[PDB]
Write an enzyme that holds these catalytic residues in place. Structure first.
Site, PDB file in Angstrom:
ATOM      1  N   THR A  28       0.843  -1.186   0.000  1.00 28.14           N
ATOM      2  CA  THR A  28       0.000   0.000   0.000  1.00 28.14           C
ATOM      3  C   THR A  28       0.884   1.244   0.000  1.00 28.14           C
ATOM      4  OG1 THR A  28      -1.441  -1.309   1.426  1.00 28.14           O
ATOM      5  CG2 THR A  28      -1.969   1.023   1.189  1.00 28.14           C
ATOM      6  N   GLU A  71      10.292  -7.158  -2.599  1.00 28.12           N
ATOM      7  CA  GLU A  71      10.721  -6.097  -3.501  1.00 28.12           C
ATOM      8  C   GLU A  71      12.192  -6.241  -3.854  1.00 28.12           C
ATOM      9  OE1 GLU A  71       7.493  -4.296  -0.830  1.00 28.12           O
ATOM     10  OE2 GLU A  71       9.081  -5.805  -0.730  1.00 28.12           O
ATOM     11  N   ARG A 116       5.171   7.055   0.016  1.00 30.78           N
ATOM     12  CA  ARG A 116       4.576   6.757   1.314  1.00 30.78           C
ATOM     13  C   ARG A 116       5.641   6.848   2.402  1.00 30.78           C
ATOM     14  NH1 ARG A 116       2.692   0.581   2.860  1.00 30.78           N
ATOM     15  NH2 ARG A 116       3.627   0.581   4.951  1.00 30.78           N
ATOM     16  N   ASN A 118      -4.218  -8.318   4.335  1.00 33.52           N
ATOM     17  CA  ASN A 118      -4.384  -6.914   4.714  1.00 33.52           C
ATOM     18  C   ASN A 118      -4.427  -6.006   3.490  1.00 33.52           C
ATOM     19  OD1 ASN A 118      -4.551  -4.676   6.599  1.00 33.52           O
ATOM     20  ND2 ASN A 118      -2.431  -4.232   6.032  1.00 33.52           N
TER      21      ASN A 118
HETATM   22  C1  LIG Z   1       8.788  -4.671   2.938  1.00 34.56           C
HETATM   23  C2  LIG Z   1       7.264  -4.486   2.884  1.00 34.56           C
HETATM   24  N1  LIG Z   1       6.625  -4.792   1.772  1.00 34.56           N
HETATM   25  C3  LIG Z   1       5.303  -4.642   1.676  1.00 34.56           C
HETATM   26  C4  LIG Z   1       4.557  -4.164   2.792  1.00 34.56           C
HETATM   27  C5  LIG Z   1       2.987  -3.971   2.707  1.00 34.56           C
HETATM   28  N2  LIG Z   1       2.201  -4.936   3.409  1.00 34.56           N
HETATM   29  C6  LIG Z   1       1.526  -4.651   4.544  1.00 34.56           C
HETATM   30  C7  LIG Z   1       1.430  -3.272   5.307  1.00 34.56           C
HETATM   31  C8  LIG Z   1       0.607  -3.499   6.626  1.00 34.56           C
HETATM   32  O1  LIG Z   1       2.659  -2.713   5.606  1.00 34.56           O
HETATM   33  C9  LIG Z   1       0.456  -2.384   4.376  1.00 34.56           C
HETATM   34  O2  LIG Z   1      -0.713  -2.923   4.133  1.00 34.56           O
HETATM   35  O3  LIG Z   1       0.854  -1.250   3.938  1.00 34.56           O
HETATM   36  S1  LIG Z   1       0.632  -6.077   5.113  1.00 34.56           S
HETATM   37  C10 LIG Z   1       1.259  -7.049   3.713  1.00 34.56           C
HETATM   38  C11 LIG Z   1       0.889  -8.511   3.517  1.00 34.56           C
HETATM   39  C12 LIG Z   1       0.392  -9.266   4.784  1.00 34.56           C
HETATM   40  O4  LIG Z   1       0.323 -10.648   4.401  1.00 34.56           O
HETATM   41  P1  LIG Z   1       0.416 -11.772   5.506  1.00 34.56           P
HETATM   42  O5  LIG Z   1      -0.063 -13.067   4.922  1.00 34.56           O
HETATM   43  O6  LIG Z   1       1.846 -11.939   5.970  1.00 34.56           O
HETATM   44  O7  LIG Z   1      -0.498 -11.374   6.748  1.00 34.56           O
HETATM   45  P2  LIG Z   1      -2.088 -11.258   6.686  1.00 34.56           P
HETATM   46  O8  LIG Z   1      -2.468  -9.804   6.499  1.00 34.56           O
HETATM   47  O9  LIG Z   1      -2.676 -11.771   7.973  1.00 34.56           O
HETATM   48  O10 LIG Z   1      -2.620 -12.064   5.531  1.00 34.56           O
HETATM   49  C13 LIG Z   1       2.050  -6.278   2.937  1.00 34.56           C
HETATM   50  C14 LIG Z   1       2.723  -6.764   1.693  1.00 34.56           C
HETATM   51  C15 LIG Z   1       5.292  -3.853   3.947  1.00 34.56           C
HETATM   52  N3  LIG Z   1       4.640  -3.355   5.112  1.00 34.56           N
HETATM   53  N4  LIG Z   1       6.628  -4.027   3.952  1.00 34.56           N
END
Ligand SMILES: Cc1ncc(C[n+]2c([C@@](C)(O)C(=O)O)sc(CCOP(=O)(O)OP(=O)(O)O)c2C)c(N)n1
Ligand code: SF4
Ligand code: SF4
Ligand code: SF4
Ligand code: SF4
Ligand SMILES: [Mg+2]
Lengths: 1164, 161
Positions: A28, A61, A111, A999
Site C-alpha cells: 500500500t 521487492e 509513502r 491486509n
Molecule cells: C517490505 C514491505 N513490503 C510490503 C509491505 C505492505 N504490506 C503490509 C502493510 C501493513 O505494511 C500495508 O498494508 O501497507 S501487510 C502485507 C501482507 C500481509 O500478508 P500476511 O499473509 O503476511 O499477513 P495477513 O495480512 O494476515 O494475511 C504487505 C505486503 C510492507 N509493510 N513491507
C-alpha cells in the site's frame, strides 16, 4: 479521451503501454498499480509492442528489483511499482541499474517510512531515501500529471539511458479520482525513440555477441570508471526537456524541469514538489488577485538537479524563498529540497533569504490556509527557519501559526461530503457519481476517500468536487455545499455539519419524522441547521430497501437522493445515468435483481422529504452532560479525541518520543457495531466454553462465581450450577459483551448442544439488559479453580489477553492468538510481523492486548514485514542475557547473610530457571521474601538484595512467540524464518495462513493453492502451494505442526502445548479463514472443518522429542477425509470466479491426494 | 561459517565449532516435486556428473545442482583436490543423487540414489582436513556428525525403496 481515474490507474496506463515485463510485489498504496496491470494482461490488452505485458510476482521487492535488473540486462523493457518499505529493499539494485545505465521506470506512490511507527500514508520519505542511487526523479502533482509525467519518464529513460523514479504522493494523488485527458497508446508509440530501443536490445546479454558486466574493480580504475557516466547525467536535463516538448505538442500541456506560477514581479516564492504544488498554485492565484507579490516554483525533475533550468524560471525580483519538504531527516541541517535550493543560489551569488519547512508527513493535511502561513512567514521581519506546518509543536516551537482561514476554491465549484459505514456502498456510489458527471458534462470532477482503521463497521468520509475550472484542491473539503450522512448513528457522534456553507444542503438517512427531529437531533446540530438556513432533507432508505427486497443495501437509494437535491445536473438526466449504470452493474444478476434496483431509484425520488424546521431551533441549548467517569489520562487526552475524529488537534507534547503505547485500551472503545448479539439459553447450555474459544473478538466468555458474589446481580443475570468436580459449589454463566460483539455469528454456529444454547437476537432489543449483565460479570472477583488448562473447557476459564481488536467480523486469525494468550500470555513476548495481525493487533491508539489482575500481559512489538523472525530471535538472545544477569545476582546472594527461607527459594530457582512452572513457583517465592529481606539488611548486603528486586521481572521464564501471516512466512520473511528455525533457539513461530496477502486486499502468495484466483493471479495460480511445514521438517530438530481450529479443537490444543514446551524451535501453521476467500463469515469455523474433511488442509504434528524416544516423529492426526474435494472449492468465491478453469480444479485434487499419500508414507 | 558448514567444522565465526548440522538444501528443493535436484562431486564420479548436467539442462523447468567444490579454506593439499572429493563421497560425507521430475510423470520413482553403499571410514576423512583437526568436546561433535551422516543416508534409502 476523458476518463475518471486515480493516480495509480493513470500511472499503470502509461507503464503498461511502454513495458514488456513488470515484476511486482504488493505494498500500500502502490499495489493498485500492479493489480490493474494484471487484469489488463488477463484480458489481453496490447502494449505499444503489440503484445500483452508479462506480470511476474516475486517473493519481495528485493527479489522484484533483481528481476528488473536481469530482465533489463537481457534486453526487455521492464518496469515495477512500489513504495515506502518496498522502495528501501530495492535501493541495492537501484545502484546497479543506474550504474549500468539501463532504461527503466519505477512508479512510486510515495509513502512514509516506518520510524517510531508504521504509516501507510503519503510523504516523500521513501523517495528521498534513494536520492543518491543515481536514478532520475520526476514528480507528478496531480492525477493528470501522473498520466503525462509517466509518459515523460518512459520516453526520457530510453533516450538518456538513466533510469527514472516517477513518484506521486501516496493516497493524496494515488487514490484521488479525477477526470483527466487519457493519452492513447497509439499516440505514445508515435513519440517513442525506436532507434533508442533497438540500441538497448543490442546491449543485451546474448551468447552470439557476449560481454561481461558487473565486474569487481580495484582502486586503480574504480574512480575513473565511476566518473565515465558523467556525460549521461549531464545530458539528462535537456533530454527530459525535449521529451516534455514532445508531450506538449501532443497534449497541449506544457511541463518544464521547473515550472513557475504567480506574479512575474513576486518577492516571496515557495519551492515545492508533488501534490503540494496544486494547493500552492490555487492559493497563489487567490493571493495574487488580492495584490500580494507571491509566486511558486514547482519541482518536476528533482534529480538530476539542473541549475540552469531552475534559475531560468526564478524571477529577478525574488527576495525571500520558502522551501517545503514532505519528509523529515532527523538531526540533518535541513531537508533535501531546502539544501539544494540553498546550494544552487549560493553557487550563483544570489542574495536571497532562503527558509525551509516540513509539511504533510504521513498524509498530514496541507490546505491553502497553511500555504498563506508559509507566505506570511516570508513577510515577517525575521522569517522562522526549519519550521513545520499543519501541527502544533508546543515542545520545540517549529510550527507556523495558522492565524486565519481563507477560501481559495474557484468560484462555481460544488463540494460534497458523504459520511458512510464500512462497505455500505457509499464510496462505490460516489465513484459512480463522479464517473457519471465526468462522462456527461464539461465539468471537472474530483473524489477523495477517507477510510477507517477498523475493518468492520468503520466510518468512511467521501470528498467530492465538481466545477467548470480544473480542480487543484488536493485537500479535504473545507466549505461544503452538501453534506450527506448515510448512517444515523453518526448523529451526535461526529461533527457532521462542520464547515457547511450558509444555505447548504444536509441529507440524512434515518427513520425519524419531522417531529422526532426535536428529540433526536442534538442542539448544536439544530443550531447550525437553523442559523445557516440549510435545506434539510431526510429519507428512510432502510425501509425502502426492505420493501423492495434489496435487504439493507442503500447505496442505490442514497445516490438517487443526492442527484435529486444537489442540482449539479438536471434531475431527469441523472435518473437516466443512474439506471443506465444499474444495467451495467446488475445486468448479469438477472431480471429480478435488475428491476429491484430500478424500483429503488423510483421509490427514492418519492420518499425524499424536506424537513421544515422551526426558526426557534437556532436558540436551542445543549443538554446537561452527565457526570463523566474517571478514565485514565491517556484515554481522556488521547484515545477519546482520536476516535472522535479530532486527533489532528493534539499537539506534539501529547505523544511519547518513541511510539510506545499502553496496553489494554480497546476495552474503552465499546463500538457497539453488532446487528445481532448472542442470547444465552441457560437450560440448553452444557458448559463447554467452545463459544468463548471461537470468538474472534473475545466478546463472549464464561464466568464462575461463588453464590455469595452474586449479591448485587441484576435480575436478568441468570446463572446455573457448575458442572465438574473442579467447580463444585460454584455458579456458571456464559455472558456476552453487547457493545464489543460484532454480530458475526460464529458462537451460535459452534454451540454443539442438542437445542442451540445461543440464538442471534437484535442488539437494540437486548442492549440495555445485557450491558448491565456484562458490567456485573466483568466486576466478578477472581475464582481459584483447578480446571486443567490443557483442555478446551479449562483454558477458557483463564482470562483472554487479546480482546476487542479491529479484525473483521468472524476473522479466522484472532481465535488462534487469543488462545495462546490464555495458555502462556502471563509470560510471553510477541514479535508480530507486518500484516493483518499487526493492523488489528497494533493500530494506534487502541491496543487489544491487555493485562490480568496482577498487571501482567503480553508485550507486543512489530518491526518490519521482512525481519520478524530475526526480530524475535534477537528478543530471545536479550531475554536470555537478562536472566543470566539475574542468576549471577542470585548466586551471589547465597554467600550473603540472608534468611534460610530466602536461600531455599534461590537454590530452587537456580536449579529450575529454564522450566516454566518451576521458575514461576520459586520466582514468586523470592518475590514474597524480598520486601522483608531488604528491611532486615543494611550496607552492601541490602544493595545485593535491591539488585535482585530490580530484576525480579525476569524470575519467571519467558515464552517468545513470533506471529505473522503466510505472506511473511512463505515469501518475504522465509529466508529469515529458515535461519531462525535452523538456529535451534527456543522460539515459537505461529503462521496465520490465509493463503493470500489479506491486509493489502488479497493478493497471490506461495501459500495460495493451485487454481485459486487472487489479486496478481487473475487467471489463477498454476504452481501448487509451497509446503512450508515440510521444509521445516527437513532439519529434524524443528517442531512442525499444522492445525485448524475449525476442524479439531483437541488437535490444536495438543500441538500448541507440545510446541511451547519443546526446548527448541517450533512452527505452528494455522489455517485462518478470511473474507478474501469469498465466503460467509458467519460460518467461518465451519469452513475450516470442511477444508480438512475435503483433504484441502492437512493436520499433522512433527515432534522431534519423539525421535529421541525411539518413536516416529511424524504423526498424521487426520488420515481419511470424508468430504468431497471439488465441492469445497465451489463454496468459496476465490475458486468459482475462475469458472481452462476445469483443468486447474483437476490439478488441485491430484496434488491433495499426493500430499495425503506422502504423509501416509512418512507416518507408516 | 555458513548453513552449508557441517557439524564440527571449525571456521571463522565458529571458533568453538558449529553445533547445528548442515542445512539440507536438496531435500527442501525436492519438496516441490517439479524441481530437478542433483548432488554431484567431480572427484568421486565422472559419469554421474555428466548425466546430472545434461538431464538438468534439457529439463523444461527449474533445475538445482549442488556440487561439492574443494577449497583452500578446508586445509588440504590442493594437489589432491579431486581426490579429496572422491574421499568425501566414499566416506558418506557428501551424497550423490538425482531427482528427476520427468520420471514421476512416467510413473517411475523421481529419486535415484547414485551411491548406495559407502566403503570408506567417516572419521578418517574428517582428520584429513585442517578445518576439522583444528578443533582437536571434539569427540562429542564428531559422534553427532557420524550419526547425522548415517541418518541422511537412511533417509535417501527410504526415498529409493
Ligand atoms: C517490505 C514491505 N513490503 C510490503 C509491505 C505492505 N504490506 C503490509 C502493510 C501493513 O505494511 C500495508 O498494508 O501497507 S501487510 C502485507 C501482507 C500481509 O500478508 P500476511 O499473509 O503476511 O499477513 P495477513 O495480512 O494476515 O494475511 C504487505 C505486503 C510492507 N509493510 N513491507
Ligand atoms: S457473535 Fe461473534 S463477535 Fe459476537 S460474541 Fe459471538 S463469536 Fe463473538
Ligand atoms: S457453546 Fe453453547 S453449550 Fe457450549 S458454553 Fe457456549 S452456550 Fe454453552
Ligand atoms: S485476516 Fe481476513 S478476516 Fe482477519 S482481519 Fe484480516 S482481512 Fe479481516
Ligand atoms: S580454492 Fe580458492 S578460488 Fe576456489 S573457492 Fe576456495 S578460496 Fe575460492
Ligand atoms: Mg495472509
Amino acid at each position: 479521451p476523458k476518463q475518471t481515474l486515480d493516480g495509480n490507474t493513470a500511472a499503470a496506463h502509461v507503464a503498461y503501454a511502454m513495458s514488456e515485463v513488470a515484476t511486482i510485489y504488493p505494498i500500500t498504496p502502490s499495489s493498485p498499480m500492479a493489480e490493474i496491470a494484471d487484469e489488463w494482461a488477463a484480458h489481453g490488452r496490447k502494449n505499444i509492442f503489440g503484445k500483452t505485458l508479462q506480470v511476474a510476482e516475486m517473493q519481495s521487492e528485493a527479489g522484484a528489483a533483481g528481476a528488473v535488473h536481469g530482465s533489463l540486462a537481457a534486453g526487455a523493457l521492464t518496469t515495477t511499482f512500489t513504495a515506502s518499505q518496498g522502495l528501501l529493499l530495492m535501493i541495492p539494485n537501484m545502484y546497479k541499474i543506474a550504474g549500468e545505465l539501463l532504461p527503466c521506470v519505477f512508479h512510486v506512490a510515495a509513502r512514509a517510512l516506518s520510524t517510531h511507527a508504521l504509516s501507510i500514508f503519503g510523504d516523500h520519505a521513501d523517495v528521498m531515501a534513494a536520492r543518491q542511487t543515481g536514478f532520475a526523479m520526476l514528480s507528478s502533482a496531480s492525477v493528470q500529471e501522473v498520466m503525462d509525467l509517466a509518459l515523460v519518464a518512459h520516453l526520457a529513460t530510453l533516450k538518456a539511458r538513466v533510469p527514472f523514479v516517477h513518484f506521486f504522493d501516496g493516497f493524496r494523488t494515488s487514490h484521488e479520482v479525477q477526470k483527466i485527458d487519457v493519452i492513447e497508446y497509439e499516440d505514445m508509440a508515435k513519440l517513442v525513440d525506436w532507434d533508442a530501443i533497438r540500441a538497448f536490445r543490442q546491449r543485451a546479454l546474448n551468447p552470439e555477441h557476449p560481454h561481461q558486466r558487473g565486474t569487481a574493480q580495484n582502486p586503480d580504475i574504480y574512480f575513473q570508471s565511476r566518473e565515465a557516466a558523467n556525460p549521461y547525467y549531464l545530458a539528462t536535463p535537456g533530454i527530459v526537456a525535449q521529451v516534455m516538448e514532445q508531450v506538449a505538442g501532443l497534449t497541449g500541456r506544457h511541463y518544464h524541469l521547473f515550472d513557475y506560477a504567480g506574479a512575474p514581479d513576486a518577492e516571496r516564492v515557495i519551492v515545492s514538489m508533488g501534490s503540494s504544488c496544486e494547493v500552492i498554485e490555487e492559493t497563489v492565484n487567490y493571493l495574487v488577485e488580492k495584490g500580494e507579490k507571491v509566486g511558486l516554483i514547482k519541482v518536476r525533475l528533482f534529480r538530476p538537479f539542473s541549475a540552469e533550468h531552475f534559475l531560468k524560471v526564478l524571477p529577478a525580483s525574488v527576495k525571500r524563498i520558502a522551501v517545503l519538504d514532505r519528509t523529515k531527516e532527523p538531526g540533518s541541517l535541513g531537508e533535501p529540497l531546502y539544501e539544494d535550493v540553498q546550494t544552487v543560489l549560493a553557487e550563483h551569488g544570489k542574495n536571497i533569504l532562503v527558509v525551509g519547512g516540513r509539511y504533510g508527513l504521513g498524509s498530514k493535511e496541507f490546505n491553502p490556509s497553511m500555504v498563506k502561513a508559509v507566505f506570511d512567514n516570508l513577510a515577517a521581519t525575521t522569517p522562522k527557519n526549519k519550521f513545520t506546518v499543519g501541527i502544533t509543536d508546543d515542545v520545540t516551537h517549529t510550527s507556523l501559526e495558522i492565524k486565519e482561514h481563507i477560501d481559495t476554491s474557484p468560484k462555481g465549484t460544488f463540494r460534497c461530503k458523504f459520511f458512510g459505514l464500512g462497505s455500505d456502498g457509499t464510496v462505490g456510489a460516489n465513484k459512480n457519481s463522479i464517473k457519471i458527471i465526468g462522462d456527461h458534462t464539461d465539468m471537472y470532477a474530483q473524489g477523495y476517500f477517507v477510510y477507517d482503521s477498523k475493518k468492520s463497521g468503520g466510518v468512511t468520509i467521501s470528498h467530492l468536487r465538481f466545477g467548470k475550472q480544473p480542480i487543484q484542491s488536493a485537500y479535504l473539503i473545507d466549505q461544503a455545499d452538501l453534506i450527506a450522512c448515510h448512517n444515523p448513528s453518526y448523529v451526535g457522534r461526529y461533527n457532521l455539519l462542520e464547515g457547511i456553507k450558509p444555505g447548504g444542503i444536509f441529507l440524512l438517512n434515518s427513520t425519524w419524522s419531522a417531529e422526532e427531529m426535536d428529540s433526536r437531533l442534538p442542539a448544536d446540530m439544530k443550531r447550525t441547521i437553523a442559523t445557516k438556513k440549510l435545506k434539510f432533507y431526510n429519507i428512510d432508505a432502510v425501509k425502502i430497501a426492505q420493501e423492495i427486497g434489496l435487504g439493507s443495501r442503500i447505496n442505490v437509494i442514497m445516490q438517487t437522493a443526492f442527484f435529486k437535491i444537489a442540482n449539479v445536473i438536471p434531475v431527469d438526466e441523472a435518473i437516466k445515468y443512474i439506471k443506465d449504470s444499474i444495467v451495467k452493474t446488475y445486468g448479469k444478476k438477472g431480471d429480478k435483481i435488475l428491476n429491484m434496483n430500478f424500483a429503488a431509484v423510483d421509490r427514492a425520488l418519492e420518499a425524499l422529504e424536506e424537513i421544515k424546521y422551526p426558526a426557534s431551533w437556532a436558540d436551542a441549548v445543549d443538554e446537561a452532560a452527565a457526570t463523566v467517569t474517571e478514565e485514565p489520562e491517556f484515554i481522556q487526552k488521547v484515545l477519546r479525541p482520536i476516535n472522535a475524529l479530532k486527533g489532528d488537534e493534539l499537539p506534539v507534547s501529547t505523544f511519547t518520543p518513541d511510539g510506545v503505547f499502553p496496553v489494554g485500551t480497546t476495552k474503552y472503545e465499546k463500538r457497539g457495531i453488532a446487528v445481532n448479539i448472542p442470547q444465552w439459553q441457560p437450560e440448553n447450555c452444557i458448559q463447554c466454553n467452545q463459544c468463548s474459544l471461537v470468538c474472534p473478538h473475545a466478546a463472549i466468555r464464561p464466568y464462575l462465581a461463588k453464590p455469595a458474589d452474586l449479591a448485587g446481580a441484576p435480575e436478568t443475570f441468570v446463572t446455573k450450577d457448575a458442572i465438574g468436580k473442579e467447580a463444585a459449589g460454584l455458579k456458571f454463566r456464559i455472558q456476552v459483551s453487547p457493545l464489543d460483539c460484532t454480530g458475526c455469528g460464529n458462537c451460535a454456529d459452534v454451540c454443539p448442544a442438542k437445542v442451540k444454547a445461543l440464538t442471534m437476537v437484535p442488539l437494540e432489543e437486548v442492549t440495555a439488559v445485557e450491558e448491565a449483565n456484562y458490567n456485573f460479570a466483568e466486576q466478578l472477583p477472581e475464582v481459584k479453580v483447578n480446571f486443567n488448562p490443557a483442555t478446551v473447557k479449562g483454558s477458557q476459564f483463564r482470562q483472554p489477553l487479546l480482546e476487542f481488536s479491529g479484525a473483521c467480523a468472524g476473522c479466522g486469525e484472532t481465535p488462534y492468538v487469543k488462545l495462546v494468550t490464555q495458555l502462556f500470555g502471563d509470560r510471553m513476548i510477541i514479535a508480530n510481523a507486518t500484516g493483518c495481525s499487526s493492523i488489528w493487533g497494533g493500530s494506534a491508539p487502541a491496543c487489544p492486548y491487555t493485562v490480568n489482575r496482577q498487571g501482567h500481559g503480553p508485550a507486543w512489538a512489530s518491526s518490519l514485514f521482512e525481519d520478524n523472525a530475526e526480530f524475535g530471535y534477537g528478543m530471545a538472545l536479550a531475554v536470555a542475557k537478562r536472566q543470566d544477569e539475574l542468576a549471577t545476582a542470585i548466586s551471589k546472594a547465597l554467600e550473603a547473610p540472608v534468611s534460610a527461607a530466602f536461600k531455599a527459594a534461590c537454590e530452587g530457582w537456580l536449579a529450575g530457571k529454564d522450566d516454566a512452572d518451576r521458575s514461576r513457583e520459586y520466582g514468586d517465592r523470592i518475590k514474597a521474601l524480598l520486601p522483608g529481606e531488604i528491611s532486615q539488611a543494611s550496607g552492601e548486603v541490602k544493595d545485593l538484595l535491591l539488585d535482585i528486586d530490580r530484576q525480579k521481572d525476569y524470575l519467571t521464564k519467558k515464552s517468545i512467540w513470533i506471529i505473522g501471516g503466510d505472506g511473511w512466512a512463505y515469501d518475504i520473511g522465509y529466508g529469515g524464518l529458515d535461519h531462525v528455525l535452523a538456529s535451534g533457539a527456543n522460539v515459537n513461530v505461529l503462521v496465520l495462513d490465509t493463503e493470500v496477502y489479506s491486509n493489502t486486499g488479497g493478493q497471490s502468495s506461495k501459500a495460495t493453492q493451485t487454481g485459486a484466483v487472487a489479486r496478481f493471479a487473475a487467471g489463477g495460480k498454476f504452481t501448487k502451494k509451497k509446503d512450508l511445514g515440510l521444509m521445516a521438517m527437513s532439519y529434524g530438530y524443528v517442531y512442525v505442526a499444522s492445525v485448524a481450529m475449525g476442524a479439531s479443537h483437541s488437535q490444536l490444543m495438543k500441538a500448541l502445548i507440545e510446541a511451547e514446551k519443546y526446548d527448541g524451535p517450533s512452527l505452528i501453521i494455522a489455517y485462518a479463514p478470511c473474507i478474501n476467500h469469498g465466503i460467509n463469515m458467519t460460518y467461518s469455523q465451519r469452513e475450516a472443518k470442511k477444508a480438512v474433511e475435503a483433504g484441502y488442509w492437512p493436520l499433522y504434528r512433527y515432534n522431534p522429542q519423539l525421535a529421541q524416544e525411539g518413536k516416529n516423529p511424524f504423526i498424521l492426526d487426520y488420515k481419511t477425509p470424508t468430504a468431497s474435494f471439488r465441492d469445497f472449492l465451489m463454496g468459496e468465491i476465490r475458486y468459482t470466479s475462475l469458472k481452462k478453469a476445469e483443468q486447474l480444479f483437476a490439478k488441485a485434487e491430484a496434488d491433495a491426494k499426493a500430499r495425503l499419500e506422502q504423509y501416509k508414507k512418512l507416518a507408516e
